Amino acid sequence: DYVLYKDATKPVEDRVADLLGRMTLAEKIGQMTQIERLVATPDVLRDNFIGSLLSGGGSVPRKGATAKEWQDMVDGFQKACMSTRLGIPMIYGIDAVHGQNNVYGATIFPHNVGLGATRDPYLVKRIGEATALEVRATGIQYAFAPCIAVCRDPRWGRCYESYSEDRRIVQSMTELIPGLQGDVPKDFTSGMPFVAGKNKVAACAKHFVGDGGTVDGINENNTIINREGLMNIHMPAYKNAMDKGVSTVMISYSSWNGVKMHANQDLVTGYLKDTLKFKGFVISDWEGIDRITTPAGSDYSYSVKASILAGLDMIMVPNKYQQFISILTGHVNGGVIPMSRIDDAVTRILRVKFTMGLFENPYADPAMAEQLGKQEHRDLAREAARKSLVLLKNGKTSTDAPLLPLPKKAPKILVAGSHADNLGYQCGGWTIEWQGDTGRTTVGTTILEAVKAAVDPSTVVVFAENPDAEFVKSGGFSYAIVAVGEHPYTETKGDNLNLTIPEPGLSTVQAVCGGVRCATVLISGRPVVVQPLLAASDALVAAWLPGSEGQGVTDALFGDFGFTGRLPRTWFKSVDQLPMNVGDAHYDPLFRLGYGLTTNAT
Ligand SMILES: *[C@@H]1O[C@H](CO)[C@@H](O[C@@H]2O[C@H](CO)[C@@H](O[C@@H]3O[C@H](CO[C@H]4O[C@H](CO)[C@@H](O)[C@H](O)[C@@H]4O[C@@H]4O[C@H](CO)[C@@H](O)[C@H](O)[C@H]4NC(C)=O)[C@@H](O)[C@H](O)[C@@H]3O[C@@H]3OC[C@@H](O)[C@H](O)[C@H]3O)[C@H](O)[C@H]2NC(C)=O)[C@H](O[C@@H]2O[C@@H](C)[C@@H](O)[C@@H](O)[C@@H]2O)[C@H]1NC(C)=O
Ligand SMILES: *[C@@H]1O[C@H](CO)[C@@H](O[C@@H]2O[C@H](CO)[C@@H](O[C@@H]3O[C@H](CO)[C@@H](O)[C@H](O)[C@@H]3O[C@@H]3OC[C@@H](O)[C@H](O)[C@H]3O)[C@H](O)[C@H]2NC(C)=O)[C@H](O[C@@H]2O[C@@H](C)[C@@H](O)[C@@H](O)[C@@H]2O)[C@H]1NC(C)=O
Numbered sequence: 001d002y003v004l005y006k007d008a009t010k011p012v013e014d015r016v017a018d019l020l021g022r023m024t025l026a027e028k029i030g031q032m033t034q035i036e037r038l039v040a041t042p043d044v045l046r047d048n049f050i051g052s053l054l055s056g057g058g059s060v061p062r063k064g065a066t067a068k069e070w071q072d073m074v075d076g077f078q079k080a081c082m083s084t085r086l087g088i089p090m091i092y093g094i095d096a097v098h099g100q101n102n103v104y105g106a107t108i109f110p111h112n113v114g115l116g117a118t119r120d121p122y123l124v125k126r127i128g129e130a131t132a133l134e135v136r137a138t139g140i141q142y143a144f145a146p147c148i149a150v151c152r153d154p155r156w157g158r159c160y161e162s163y164s165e166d167r168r169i170v171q172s173m174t175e176l177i178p179g180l181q182g183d184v185p186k187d188f189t190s191g192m193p194f195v196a197g198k199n200k201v202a203a204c205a206k207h208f209v210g211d212g213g214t215v216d217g218i219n220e221n222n223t224i225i226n227r228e229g230l231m232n233i234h235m236p237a238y239k240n241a242m243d244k245g246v247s248t249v250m251i252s253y254s255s256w257n258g259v260k261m262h263a264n265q266d267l268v269t270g271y272l273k274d275t276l277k278f279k280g281f282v283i284s285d286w287e288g289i290d291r292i293t294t295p296a297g298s299d300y301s302y303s304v305k306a307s308i309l310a311g312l313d314m315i316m317v318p319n320k321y322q323q324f325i326s327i328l329t330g331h332v333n334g335g336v337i338p339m340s341r342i343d344d345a346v347t348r349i350l351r352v353k354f355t356m357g358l359f360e361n362p363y364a365d366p367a368m369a370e371q372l373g374k375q376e377h378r379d380l381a382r383e384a385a386r387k388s389l390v391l392l393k394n395g396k397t398s399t400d401a402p403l404l405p406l407p408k409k410a411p412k413i414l415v416a417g418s419h420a421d422n423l424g425y426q427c428g429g430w431t432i433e434w435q436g437d438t439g440r441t442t443v444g445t446t447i448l449e450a451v452k453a454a455v456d457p458s459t460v461v462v463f464a465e466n467p468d469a470e471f472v473k474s475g476g477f478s479y480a481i482v483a484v485g486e487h488p489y490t491e492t493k494g495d496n497l498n499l500t501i502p503e504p505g506l507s508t509v510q511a512v513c514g515g516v517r518c519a520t521v522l523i524s525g526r527p528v529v530v531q532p533l534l535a536a537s538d539a540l541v542a543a544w545l546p547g548s549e550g551q552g553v554t555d556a557l558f559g560d561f562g563f564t565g566r567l568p569r570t571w572f573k574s575v576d577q578l579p580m581n582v583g584d585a586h587y588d589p590l591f592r593l594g595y596g597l598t599t600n601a602t
């Protein structure tokens with residue numbers, strides 16, 4: 001017979017229905033199953049008709065693996081999936097959340113909070129475009145981004161993954177989506193999924209919904225807010241995502257007024273699917289269904305029932321697929337979960353796969369490998385890093401000479417601090433490892449390296465990680481650049497009730513600035529206690545987590561470009577004020593949202 005679903009000339013909806021009508025229950029449940037590459041094998045993928053794989057943070061074929069190595073890995077998995085009776089290609093997902101960040105040599109862009117500081121949605125679109133190319137360079141078709149959380153309390157470990165505490169800024173930055181996926185057609189119906197083809201990736205608006213509104217910024221916790229507030233703060237950017245054809249939505253670990261998002265049929269089915277008319281696929285977070293219960297995983301039968309009935313389509317298991325498949329099969333065999341629900345989930349998954357061209361181009365393009373770390377993308381990251389910087393102070397009194405921009409020609413200068421020559425620290429979490437890491441973890445340019453690359457050949461650059469006061473006073477320095485701040489973190493490991501930077505940091509700034517005029521570069525995922533750093537410093541720059549291209553920092557320090565970044569978040573006076581956001585009745589910031597000093601290019 002002619003087999004319609006294999007015909008690339010046929011409409012997506014026709015292809016979906018034709019394929020769905022041929023599938024066994026095992027093949028359907030297989031599509032709904034996403035597994036870690038760490039548990040995948042050719043036989044496993046074939047035997048269980050697996051629909052998707054992912055790499056979690058740090059889940060890589062080997063350290064320092066080339067783009068070709070990633071392609072060969074993904075293709076090996078694909079070959080197994082293509083060998084099934086129906087030959088449904090798998091989709092491979094990864095957290096490419098500031099570039100293709102798990103991958104050695106990938107361009108690392110500034111994290112979201114810094115991007116928010118740029119107020120430049122077209123810049124963010126261009127980052128999406130570059131990111132899609134670097135993800136496809138590694139054979140991967142699906143990025144778990146953007147995080148469109150609206151972080152309402154910086155004690156949250158994922159505050160850096162949020163563009164802003166102001167939903168309007170988060171809404172504007174949804175331009176990442178058509179960057180990653182391609183621009184939607186003129187005819188486009190809001191809520192339909194879209195990916196332009198083999199040089200773009202499926203995107204993922206996450207985490208639905210209110211992940212940024214949890215009590216005291218406790219990760220995965222309870223968001224206590226009325227429906228009006230949920231809809232006014234936490235929801236708006238999802239509608240922009242629908243308008244831009246986001247292919248997938250990932251559900252949050254968090255709860256809304258005590259109801260787990262992973263079990264919330266009202267929001268997932270009633271609102272996202274039935275009201276916003278979302279027609280792509282809904283994916284769980286990692287063991288997100290396990291975490292419906294207390295303790296997590298204590299009633300996995302319930303977890304599967306609750307989540308699938310709530311409206312989730314694909315489960316990021318990611319390890320215990322046999323248990324998942326067995327339990328879901330049993331619920332269906334028993335009539336507890338209707339075939340209509342399974343058919344809906346599979347319809348949505350297949351719709352995304354056919355739409356994005358996956359059946360036509362299931363394998364990697366070796367000619368794309370060279371896109372990884374491409375200099376043009378690094379130039380873009382450098383632009384973004386520079387634009388993200390917020391100048392908080394530029395002179396100790398209203399009558400001092402402005403310190404910035406600094407002269408490129410001086411007899412001798414000092415570069416100091418724990419963050420001056422630490423690529424891992426300047427990238428933060430979700431870089432190479434899940435939690436990020438310390439030192440030279442990838443290809444990039446540290447602040448020290450950037451200074452050396454910028455200054456006149458006659459200027460002597462001295463590096464001292466933690467010099468004492470006497471070293472500085474006796475050094476004959478013209479000025480110093482001192483870089484300090486937070487260590488890399490991700491998710492719960494980043495939750496922090498005190499928001500004070502690790503030492504040595506302040507002590508180094510005090511030692512250096514006490515001896516010579518100093519520009520302090522603060523590397524952080526969020527506002528942190530800053531008055532003492534301010535008091536010591538002639539100038540102070542909030543650089544956020546600027547990524548691999550440290551020359552973005554020096555581009556502004558030395559006046560190649562003027563500072564333009566503006567705070568995308570409130571800077572608090574103390575943590576006991578928190579939560580405190582723009583528009584609050586009680587609003588007493590150290591620096592308001594939108595604050596930022598400027599300079600002009602030399
Ligand atoms: C304000 O709250 C913060 C969050 O609660 C808190 O930071 C956390 O402190 C705890 C300890 O109280 C840390 O847990 C331990 O981490 C040890 C190793 O920590 C180093 O490596 C990790 C990455 O693996 C970094 O994230 C850390 O920052 C730290 O980095 C090292 O720091 C040195 C000093 O600056 C540097 O010289 C050094 O170069 C640098 N090294 C690296 C690799 O960058 C582990 O060995 C411990 O076992 C412990 O781990 C925990 O074990 C219990 C388990 O429940 C936890 O899940 C597990 O994490 C934690 O890492 C840290 N969180 C961060 C930074 O994200 C602040 O504490 C301050 O900083 C810490 C690091 C200590 O210096 C404290 O003495 C200090 O108080 C809180 N600040 C205040 C004022 O109270
Ligand atoms: C010395 O520095 C100052 C301060 O940065 C420069 O003035 C700024 O110039 C910006 C760029 O031209 C102005 O931004 C624009 O503002 C308009 C009006 O709101 C807006 O419609 C534009 O989109 C743009 O806004 C930016 O868009 C990109 C975002 O990422 C960014 O966050 C937005 O700010 C800005 O308003 C202006 N600021 C002030 C206080 O005047 C100044 O530049 C000089 O003057 C401006 C007005 C303009 O005519 C420039 O061509 C001109 O160079 C700069 N001076 C020099 C000599 O470089």
Ligand SMILES: *[C@@H]1O[C@H](CO)[C@@H](O[C@@H]2O[C@H](CO)[C@@H](O[C@@H]3O[C@H](CO)[C@@H](O)[C@H](O)[C@@H]3O)[C@H](O)[C@H]2NC(C)=O)[C@H](O)[C@H]1NC(C)=O
Pocket residue numbers: 218220221222255258294295
């Ligand atoms: C929001 O976060 C709080 C704080 O982490 C969560 O409450 C905590 O819930 C855990 C279990 O999920 C409790 O752990 C248990 O502690 C008791 C101690 O008697 C012990 O018997 C158990 O073995 C287990 O370890 C923990 O006590 C509790 N913490 C506090 C201080 O209340 C809360 O569940 C989170 N809410 C949401 C919606 O996620």
Ligand SMILES: OC[C@@H]1[C@@H](O)[C@H](O)[C@@H](O)c2nc(-c3ccccc3)cn21
Pocket residue numbers: 055056057095144206285286491
């Ligand atoms: O990496 C896959 C997803 C990612 O896309 C989500 O944004 C994020 O919430 C997340 N946390 C874990 C994860 C959490 C705890 C242990 C192991 C893994 C896994 N993931």
